[PDB]
Amino acid sequence: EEKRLSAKKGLPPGTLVYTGKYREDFEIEVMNYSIEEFREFKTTDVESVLPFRDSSTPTWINITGIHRTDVVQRVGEFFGIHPLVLEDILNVHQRPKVEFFENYVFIVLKMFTYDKNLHELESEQVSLILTKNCVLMFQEKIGDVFDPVRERIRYNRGIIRKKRADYLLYSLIDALVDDYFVLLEKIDDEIDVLEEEVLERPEKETVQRTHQLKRNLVELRKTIWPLREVLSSLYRDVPPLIEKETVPYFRDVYDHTIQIADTVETFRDIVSGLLDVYLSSVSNKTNEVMKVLTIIATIFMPLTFIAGIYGMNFEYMPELRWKWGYPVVLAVMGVIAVIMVVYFKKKKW
Amino acid sequence: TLVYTGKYREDFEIEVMNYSIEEFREFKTTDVESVLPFRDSSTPTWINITGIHRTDVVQRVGEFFGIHPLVLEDILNVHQRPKVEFFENYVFIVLKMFTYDKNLHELESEQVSLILTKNCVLMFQEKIGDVFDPVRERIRYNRGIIRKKRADYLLYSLIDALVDDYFVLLEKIDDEIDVLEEEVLERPEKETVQRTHQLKRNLVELRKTIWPLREVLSSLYRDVPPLIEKETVPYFRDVYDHTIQIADTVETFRDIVSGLLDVYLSSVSNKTNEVMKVLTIIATIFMPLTFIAGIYGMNFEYMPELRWKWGYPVVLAVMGVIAVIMVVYFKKKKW
Amino acid sequence: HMEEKRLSAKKGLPPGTLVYTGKYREDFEIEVMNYSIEEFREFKTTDVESVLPFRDSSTPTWINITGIHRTDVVQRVGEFFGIHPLVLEDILNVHQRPKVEFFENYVFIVLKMFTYDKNLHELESEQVSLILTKNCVLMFQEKIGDVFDPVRERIRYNRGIIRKKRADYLLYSLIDALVDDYFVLLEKIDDEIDVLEEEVLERPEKETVQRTHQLKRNLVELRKTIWPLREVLSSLYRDVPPLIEKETVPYFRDVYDHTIQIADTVETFRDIVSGLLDVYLSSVSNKTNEVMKVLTIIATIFMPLTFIAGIYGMNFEYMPELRWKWGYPVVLAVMGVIAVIMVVYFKKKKWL
Amino acid sequence: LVYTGKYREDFEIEVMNYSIEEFREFKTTDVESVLPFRDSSTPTWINITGIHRTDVVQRVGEFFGIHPLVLEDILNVHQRPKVEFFENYVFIVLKMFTYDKNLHELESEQVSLILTKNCVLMFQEKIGDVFDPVRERIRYNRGIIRKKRADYLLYSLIDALVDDYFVLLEKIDDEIDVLEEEVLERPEKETVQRTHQLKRNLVELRKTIWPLREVLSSLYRDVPPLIEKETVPYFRDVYDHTIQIADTVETFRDIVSGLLDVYLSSVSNKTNEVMKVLTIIATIFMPLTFIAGIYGMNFEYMPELRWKWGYPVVLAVMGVIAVIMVVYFKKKKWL
Amino acid sequence: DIQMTQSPSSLSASVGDRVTITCRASQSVSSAVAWYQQKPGKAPKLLIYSASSLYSGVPSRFSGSRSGTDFTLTISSLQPEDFATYYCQQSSSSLITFGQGTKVEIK
Known part of the structure; x- marks a missing residue:
């Protein structure tokens, strides 16, 4: 929001540092679609993606791999994005937030993947910027949740192909919330397995898994509450950029986030009960x-x-x-x- | 290469019923060749296949009808949750029957598949005995409006009968929960502990089976499939509401049994x-x-x-x- | 019920039947509190046709139907006031969470009143439903006993500014009284926590762990009820439906803050109960x-x-x-x- | 009418009319002596202690034109802090918290504050309050309090209450230091109960801060006609003081949680x-x-x-x- | 069809005595069991519904209970106005069936 970029210590002034841990891969996908046609384009050259800024038809730019601070800087400079927004883009240890500017809206969101046979919960921060006719989206690594939106654009399915970029922002956010539901289903299955195991055989692996699950649920709560706040902010007023036609959809997603928060709180209570059950059984x-x-x-x-x-x-x-x-x-x-x-x-x- | 899953392979029988607004006929046979001309008829029919272990039969019917192989492995794969598949020529739905035994508390589940194809409905059962006898009784005795409709109403009748059997299962589990709570409160014993644990596991299996089924019915009615006629949308909606009832009862029952477990395990x-x-x-x-x-x-x-x-x-x-x-x-x- | 708002289908009932879901079928009474800037009137009747004409009354009126086991009275009021049948089903449905639904002609809210019972360590909720239509506020209750006596006292004795304002202020006042009684309930729970702490720290009896566990279950149920209440108040304050008049909108911010306070207090109480369990186990x-x-x-x-x-x-x-x-x-x-x-x-x- | 106060033995009435031109203080319990002070142009601060005798409060409320329900609220004891605005007066209710040494007990004391035009009336449950510095400053003619109106008197009393809160927090800080030394030196059941008493009292302080925040926020945001300016920055400063009190209480809560964890680990x-x-x-x-x-x-x-x-x-x-x-x-x- | 067997067919007792009437259903009826008191030549009166809840206006001596498919009606202390025929009903299905009646007579 402020013109002055934050001044970190030990770093030369005016520097931007990627904060996460992923540096393996980098790729830029562009999916320009109109009322009557679409186009797909996967390259590693930022220059071939820059002219899409002023296209009348909606554009979806997906820049995967933000360890290349140069690409982020070039995209931000060409699109007129403030340096502090770029700093927030590159900062990963950041809870979800939404920021409103005159020419764009900046949204910070978080994904999640659960691993089977090795119960670890991982997070990946995705940033979306809705400028003019374009929706910039920055990702840490290959692998996302917006494949259904990709296929809908490819096959001209639904009302997405006939609408503007704000509906694309909707589609991406709703897909993210849907995979939040998928994650909750996976965690509920793991909770059932843990419940049976702890109630049948108290071991050290049982408490290890249960405590890891408890930490993961606390992390999920801390991530899911600000996401509900930012969706509330997206459907309450959002004057300049988002059309008044798309607000019922954002209301729907806000209700979905309420349901997710209720579910994760129920899971926390169940896991606390599991810990008490283990103590009593031992x-x-x-x-x-x-x-x-x-x-x-x-x-x-x-x-x-x-x-x-x-x-x-x-x-x-x-x-x-x-x-x-x-x-x-x-x-x-x-x-x-x-x-x-x-x-x-x-x-x- | 299709591999079977069902433990038992004792019996195998094939039957088919061809009903129309004017006339009616039912056929029973052992050879797989006799069911081939029945699909050619315009009148909706209903082929009942007991035993999926006969892999040549399922391969033949899959290749003749025009069914993708993945559907064939899914029919062969008993160990799977209920789901729906939307394909441009047919809709593929798998469900799960249930049998509960009293005086010996176990919950046994038998997978059932349903394929709706134009003017014919295909189902592949696992063993003799099912919960669709009332549908056959209504077909034979001219009860209801099933004959006046197409195969979509037949699929509706099948799903509705299965949900009715779910309601009967819930009644039996209601009796079990009542006697179990009374016995646990009156006298806490190890056998009561085993009964509570088994009942909790049974309710967990019920939830894992019923919650996807509600989504399946929602897909059947809300998505407006091209094969399913618009006239049958309200009936699928009604079955969806019945599944809502079943799910609510299952959650309440799990809450009751979990409370029982906590109350028992409080004092050590x-x-x-x-x-x-x-x-x-x-x-x-x-x-x-x-x-x-x-x-x-x-x-x-x-x-x-x-x-x-x-x-x-x-x-x-x-x-x-x-x-x-x-x-x-x-x-x-x-x- | 969000999808197109149709009447749901049950299995053991004829298609259109509305069924009361709770357990209270003892008492039935209709109480009206019609007031103006200067004049007010009130009466108690068991005849619903004596409250039907108040739909078109210009002055703010408060129809209060106690006892919803009489599905006939609820259906008659809904038919006369033009209430959707699904709204009536939700009114008669007790096993539910607090919700708010905005319609083009009325606002439908569902709330809960708890009554913690001493010497019987359990709390029981009673569902109350409100319909704010035109210039009348419909209130539905399960049994005798409510938390809205201060509002009646304010109307009777011309306290505050309630007489000047319209029906939306009456709705605000009712929700305010309900959340204040939530504060009172939390105070009672705190007293119970005090007694439980004394028992835990003094004598580790056999029933003290059971009391801790049932208190924890009570707090869990309280959280499950209070969170939707916060949702309702945030929706009322922020979505500003036309029936609220934009002049009473700031009055809902206080209630929203109150629900936030109540949620925080419930969280702290749960933490205290868990700590008490830890201390008890340490003593053993x-x-x-x-x-x-x-x-x-x-x-x-x-x-x-x-x-x-x-x-x-x-x-x-x-x-x-x-x-x-x-x-x-x-x-x-x-x-x-x-x-x-x-x-x-x-x-x-x-x-040694 | 109905009064449920904890203390009934003490009863005393104080009137203290102050002005730059002259100063005056009144004593004894003459009920009729307090009425004429409402006509004075100079600000006056009537202090009333002991509400068990409802006749005096009834008379003073009737003569001052206060609603009977406000008087009943004054008679109440377990009332959360609140501010009610009326055309002629404003009703302020707050808590006064006292902490005694050698006993880890947190005690409440409700105080009411109403000012009309220039006259300010207190309501004390028991003898003793933390407004002694304020009245001493009034006597000594220090600050700009004597040249301002009754709104500045209300601000001064609230500031004194916040300073009393501060004193309570450093007393609890010393308490925490002593019990930390004890728990890291010698653990025993008494140390456990004393630390958990700290935990509950800190929870109580956190609970009581929020209504104080709400009443202060309403007070400096609603800009009432009765309170005509010269109060916004001071109430904002009191609000900031409340924020700091909340932060200190949170830090103390973290400390005592650490202490309890230490004791459990030691056992x-x-x-x-x-x-x-x-x-x-x-x-x-x-x-x-x-x-x-x-x-x-x-x-x-x-x-x-x-x-x-x-x-x-x-x-x-x-x-x-x-x-x-x-x-x-x-x-x-x-090993 | 669900059929419920009510026993004993007739038991005689005096005032102040706890009298129990049981009624067992062949099939599973969840809790929809109602108890009715009928004095001779008059219309039946409802006492307990849902197998445990007593109707509004009924004396507290009457009480009902359930343990599986077995339902019991007990009167804590008989009165001269409690000697009538008591019936047992299931309403779990649309085809309502009654019991057989257990006449209580002063002895």
Whole structure:
């Protein structure tokens, strides 16, 4: 928003630094579509993409790989994007936000992918800029969620092909929310599996997985609340750039985000219940082990005491050669064992 | 190359019914060749195929009708959630029947497929016995308006009968939940724990089966498929609402059983006190007397106990005094 | 119900039937509070035709129907006031979350009143529905007892500015009273948390964990109810439907802030309850550890001595050991020194 | 009418009319003496303590033209802070919080503030308030308070309340320091209860800040006709003070959460340590005594009695067993 | 069709005694069981619906319970006006069926 770019320490002034971790790949896809035709174009040359700024027909530019700060700088300079917006584009450790300017709207969103057989939740920040007839979109790496919008434009399906760029911004945001729902389904399946495992067999892997799931759910909450806020901001007023015809769609997406937030809060509560269940189950197992150990200890320590009796080398044995002394002490053996077994059965151990 | 999934392969039977607004006829046969001319007829028909293990039969019908292979593996793949497939020539829907046994609580599920093709509906069952008998009864006895409509109404009748069986399943599970809660509250036992766990697992399976089915019905009615006539949209809408009811009941039932589990598992406390006090007092009583009995096992030429008179009564009295002192000191520490 | 707003289809009912869903079928009463700048009137009747003519009354009026098990009264009011049948189904549907729907001629809101019960650690909600149409506010209740007595007192005694303003101000006042009673409910929950904390920290009884768990479930249900209430208030403040007149719109900001406060307080209460559970478990573990102290010290002072006794209590030959002179006092001093050393080691360990 | 105050023993009436030209203070409980002060052009600050006698408050409200419902709200005790604006007066209700040493109890004290034209009326539940510096400054003729109107008096009283909050926060800071020293030095049940009392009191302070924020925000945003300027920057400063109070309370909450985590960790560590020492000595010495018991046979014909001087061999085996048991602990990182 | 067998067909008891009437359905009816009291020659009166909820205006002595497909009606303390025939109804389906009636007579 401000003209002056932020001044970091240890960096030469006026520098822009990519913040994330992905540097493998870079590619620019352009999908220019009109009422009667479309075009597709995948290159790594920024110059062939720049003239699409002033095209009357809507344009979709997808620049994947923002570690190339030079490409981001060139696109921002040509499109008139302020330097601070570019800094926010390159900053990854940033919660979702929406910013309104005179000639464009800048939206920061976040994707998510869940990995099977290795439960880790990963995030990737995508930025969208709606300028004039174009929708710039910046991505960290190959792999996104907007394939359905691509196919809809390719096959002239729906009302997307006959509308302006704001409907394209809608399509992308709704696809992102849809894959949020997909992620929630994956997480719910994992929660069911974890529930069965913890309730059936308490192990260290169980608490490891459950705590990782808890951290992931907290991260999801922290990501999903500002996204609801920014969709609210997109459908409340949005004066300059977004037409009044497209606001019911943004309202629909806002409702979807409300549902997602409710679901993630339910998941948090369920996971807390799972942690309590694990603690109770482990306490019960330790109690059972103590029951067993105490049973044998209580039925054998007095036995060792009576074995120590008649085990002392004293001159005067009362039953020094009494007949059936071993049978009578074994009878006392059996009687004591039986009576302690009966007594412990009274308390239902 | 199609691989089967169903564990059992005991039986295999094929039947088909051709009904029209004027006349009616039903056919039963074993050979796969007899069902070929039935599709050529304009009147809607209904081929019932029990047993998908006969892979040559399914391959033949798939190649004759014009069905993509992936549908064939999906029909062969029993272990899959219900879903709908929209293709330019046919719609492919897979559902899941359910059987619940009383006095032995298990939940068994049998996959069922449904392919709607122009003026014919194809279904591939897994075994004998199903829940579509009322549809056949209505076909035979001229009940309802099914004959006056095309194959879309037949698909509607099949799905509606399956949802009705789901309602019956919910009734049985209602009885199970009632008796289970009453027994758990009246007397908590391990068998009740097993019953609660099994019921929770059964409800989880029910949810995993029913929640996609609601989306399937939503796709059947809301998307306005080209094959499904506009006249049958309200009927699919009604089945969608019935699925809404089933889902709501399933969620309520899982909430009830989860509450039961939590209430049962709340209390574990008393053991850590009682059994541990018992162990500590027993050990502290019997270790010192054992030590006093074992110190005399020392082997030496000379030892004072040899000369002392009544050494055994003396050591027994000392051990008894020590035990009395320890037990009295135990009352100071309580427990 | 969002898709085209049609009447849903059940299975055990004829197609068009509206069914009351709750459990309260005891009392039925219709209460009207019609007021103006100077004059006001009120009456209680069990006849709905005595409140039907008030639809066209110019002055603000407040029709309050208590007891919705009488589906006939609800259907008659809906037919006379032009209410959509799905709205009536939602009115009679109790197992629901608070919602707001804006129609071209009226505004439909669903809210909840809780009543925490002492000595019976559970809270019960009652659904109240509001329809703000033209110059009348329709209120539907399940049973006798509500939180809107201050609004009645304000109307009767000409307090505030309620008499001057129109029906939308009455709707604002009703929602304000409901959220204030939410604050009162939170205060009662805080008192229960105080009692539970005293029980946990003083005597770790058997039922204290059950009370913690049921209080946690109560907070969970409260959160599940309050979040949609915040949604409703944000929608009322921000979507500014035509029936609100844009002059009462700032009055909803206070209520929105109040719902935000209530949600934050519910979160803090949940955290407090979880911390109480943690303290209780720590106390139980500390008791078991106090038992561990005695058991471990007895074992660690007795086992090695009996081990030495067992080593010496053995029968071999051809070795100048075992049978000795004055060796028994030597071993006596040996385990005496061992016991003294173990006691000294315990002194370092700071217990016994 | 109905009054539910906690304290009923004390009752005192104060009137303090101040002006630059002269100063005046009034004492005693003459109910009729307070009425004529409403006609004075110079600002006056009537302070009333003790509401258990409803007759005096009823009379003063009736003579001042206050609504009976406002008087009933004054009589209430468990009332959240609120501001109500009327054509002739404004009703302010707030909380006064006092903290006593040697007891970790947070106490509430409701105070009401109403100003009309130039007369300001207080309502105290109990004797004692934090407005003593304000009245002392009035007596000493310091600041611009005597040259302003009653709105500045209301601002001064609210500022004094905020300063009292500040004093309470540094007292709780010292409390937190002491209990942190105790918990890192010596943990006990009393320290647990005292830290958790801090936690609950901090939650209470957080709860009470928000209505104060709301009432202040309304006060400096609604620009009432009764409060005619010369109040916006001062109320904004009080708002900023409230923000800082909230931040300090949040920091204290983090501190006490850390303390409670520390105590739980200490308990777990002690349990682990005692179990560790018991298990180590058990596993190192019980097997050795088992072997000794095995070799404690008294057989007349013992083939293992003589095995090429097996005595040192057996003790070497015992030493090796002890060493390997200790090493196995070291291998899996026990000590 | 669901058929419900009501037992005992007739049991005699005096005032102040707890009297229990049971009624078991062959098929599964979830909870839609209603209990009716009919004195001779008059129209039946509703006592309990939903197998546990007593109708408004009914004395608190009457109470109902359910355990699976088994439904019971109990009167905590009989009165001279509680000697009539009690019926058991299921309304789970559209085809409503009744019980057989258990006449309570003073003894």
